[PDB]
Design a protein around this ligand. Structure first.
Ligand SMILES: Cc1ncc(COP(=O)(O)O)c(C[NH2+]CCCC[C@H](N)C(=O)O)c1O
Ligand SMILES: Cc1ncc(COP(=O)(O)O)c(C[NH2+]CCCC[C@H](N)C(=O)O)c1O
Lengths: 394, 394
């Protein structure tokens, strides 16, 4: 169906196959059938208003890390009682705004945050439902930037301090602790660290209840990685089974905060070839690191597939930006290409456009959705949009 | 003067001391007094319309890498005959648009680009002034992402292919080769690799002229680094002296494309403290990697200075974003701080806001200028600006 597409839309652009988002979400809803669970899509992976509306129709929840995300979610149709707010740096304005929006709960990451929420809750005359994120100091075995479960990391808190915080929330007349939460990392290929984390948190949860803390939710976060380089992926059945066994004796609603595993595969970066250059061969395309930062930021490798039917040789697929970090794949192996040919960077649905910038003064890309039925979900940015907010200062 | 500032403006924001931009530019204009030179500020470092207008008043030139940058420069008042367009991925639209704007020249990076420019030039009935970027395969001794002078990199071309391209431009009736160009890297602390590059390119330039190619410009690019961690910096006097000696016998106008060394120091990231968290101590501030990507992308370290007068201990200064890469300084050493205190991240004038994104749905920061006289040079983004272009798809 590519022909009609390239005739009506200029490259480069993000193209999303919506069914895969629906199917991926649905696989999470059924993984936990014999139990009460809540799947909160992590907006950070991709907050496009349209994909959120799709998830909202499937009654998805939302794991937000900012007021901006909470608003996107509400605007897309996600129910406030299915929204959870995490974040080690929530500002008083975000805290206050969250409380007035009646979301499920604020997942606190510091004792000082807990007190800040109490002070605001009290002034608003409401009892804030809150969850406490614990750092189980477990190595998720992943990229350091994507690793968040070690004492080293700024996320959550130790068992000792957690117990102290829960008790404090219990005593407060403006705090209602109702959930325990953890998230050891992202793009995880090993299910063991996850299970080990669930066991440790389940142990403290059992202890928390024995102390009167009335828990109702057990949040495991997200973290399941995708097959970027054809690696084996943690199966949901094995994931859900491991968690249910870790929760023996605890009658709690399980919450999952998957992001990448919901949208990664459904999104592809369609970019056109501009030139071919040569002892090494460089294939210059019109998309750049400003559009897709994963490769440079995490040395990630996404598959590149030629869409235009067409001698194979090694070559670095590079974008137009002035930096050496602006190269999608080193020594990729592709046939000889010519100006205008089209290629697709695979599995860019997560942390693709959500981390894109306008570096080198390049407008944010057009985003298209496929629904059996091509339509635009984000209009391309005009050149003037780049400096719109700088004109009055000129 | 901070008091009035914090009373009228909310953190976090970028604050620019304009004099330092003026002074830094002026130091480049005089480094080459006994010669004809042209200083083309590299927009990529910071394209804010206002700082460009300042430079335009000092009759600065502009080194652009996209049509968006060329337009910013023109709009700020920079003369078209002082604008040079580099880029390994210029699209036909940018090429054509550049030609119609009568800029100084297109600095080509591939033989295929050269032919693309010719085809367009011919259709427009004009003779395109062009420069050819050569890759001298010299190690600038810097961070790999910031290193661009090796055969390994996608920038420029070898001597053999360069000679072939220049001759091709000479024969063409729509191409006028008038300049040689090179840029081995960014944030360079060692002046030797620069000098070695100038010598090699000066040798080929001498050879090019002997073959009838009428050169008028000798472009050395930018690259001079700043003192982020109190290191010694390449002095302009030593830089200009080394270049003049390398150019013995060549009567050519020298062009410099400095970026970082023009605006780095003049810009600071003013951010407020939100919480303090504890065996390690984390200082959570309201600015994040989405606002300043250097630390995560290049493991860069910028100095952090407390602005609020106030026991010193080790601590990681972190932002609010959900990733472990969102930490400004590991084991920094600062006094005990409390919610509301103000700190400034130093030398963020270059590649600061120019690489900023809206990750975690965070609006682009407010940018203020100091001119003896605080005024806004970029209004903060509203929350609705985040999803403005996504509403019609909803
Ligand atoms: C608390 C919390 N919940 C869910 C997630 C999302 O997990 P995932 O998408 O299922 O892995 C997170 C993860 N936060 C950081 C993810 C960084 C990804 C990075 N930009 C990349 O790979 O491009 C979380 O904090
Ligand atoms: C051809 C060309 N001219 C000038 C520069 C600018 O040089 P500088 O600012 O004086 O070093 C460049 C450099 N291009 C890449 C710079 C990447 C910087 C990176 N984002 C960072 O340090 O944050 C050039 O290509």
């Amino acid at each position: 169906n590519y022909e009609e597409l390239f005739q009506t839309h200029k490259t480069p652009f993000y193209l999303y196959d919506f069914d895969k988002i629906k199917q991926a979400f649905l696989n999470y809803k059924e993984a936990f059938k014999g139990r009460k669970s809540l799947i909160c899509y992590a907006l950070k992976a991709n907050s496009n208003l349209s994909i959120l509306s799709l998830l909202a129709h499937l009654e998805s929840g939302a794991d937000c890390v900012s007021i901006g995300e909470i608003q996107r979610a509400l605007k897309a149709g996600i129910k406030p009682y299915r929204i959870v707010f995490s974040g080690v740096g929530k500002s008083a304005f975000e805290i206050e705004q969250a409380l007035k929006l009646n979301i499920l709960f604020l997942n606190v990451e510091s004792f000082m945050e807990l007190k800040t929420i109490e002070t605001i809750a009290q002034s608003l005359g409401i009892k804030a439902r809150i969850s406490i994120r614990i750092n189980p100091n477990i190595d998720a075995k992943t990229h350091p930037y994507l690793s968040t479960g070690l004492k080293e990391n700024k996320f959550g808190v130790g068992e000792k301090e957690a117990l102290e915080m829960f008790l404090w929330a219990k005593k407060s007349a403006f705090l209602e602790p109702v959930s325990v939460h953890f998230h050891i990392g992202s793009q995880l290929l090993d299910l063991e660290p996850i299970i080990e984390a669930s066991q440790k948190v389940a142990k403290i949860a059992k202890s928390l209840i024995a102390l009167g803390i009335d828990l109702r939710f057990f949040d495991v976060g997200g973290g399941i990685g995708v097959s970027y380089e054809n690696e084996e992926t943690i199966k949901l059945y094995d994931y859900a089974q491991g968690i249910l066994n870790a929760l023996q004796g605890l009658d709690l609603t399980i919450i999952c905060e998957p992001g990448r595993s919901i949208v990664a595969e459904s999104g592809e970066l369609i970019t056109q070839v501009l030139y071919e250059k040569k002892n090494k061969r460089f294939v210059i395309v019109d998309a750049g690191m400003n559009d897709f930062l994963r490769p440079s930021l995490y040395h990630a490798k996404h598959a590149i597939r030629v869409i235009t039917p067409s001698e194979i040789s090694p070559c670095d697929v590079v974008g137009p930006v002035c930096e050496s970090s602006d190269t999608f794949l080193k020594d990729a192996h592709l046939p000889e290409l010519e100006p205008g040919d089209k290629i697709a960077i695979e599995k860019v649905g997560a942390y693709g456009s959500s981390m894109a910038s306008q570096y080198n003064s390049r407008p944010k890309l057009l985003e298209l959705a496929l629904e059996d039925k091509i339509r635009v979900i984000r209009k391309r940015e005009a050149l003037e949009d780049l400096w719109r907010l700088e004109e009055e200062g000129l």
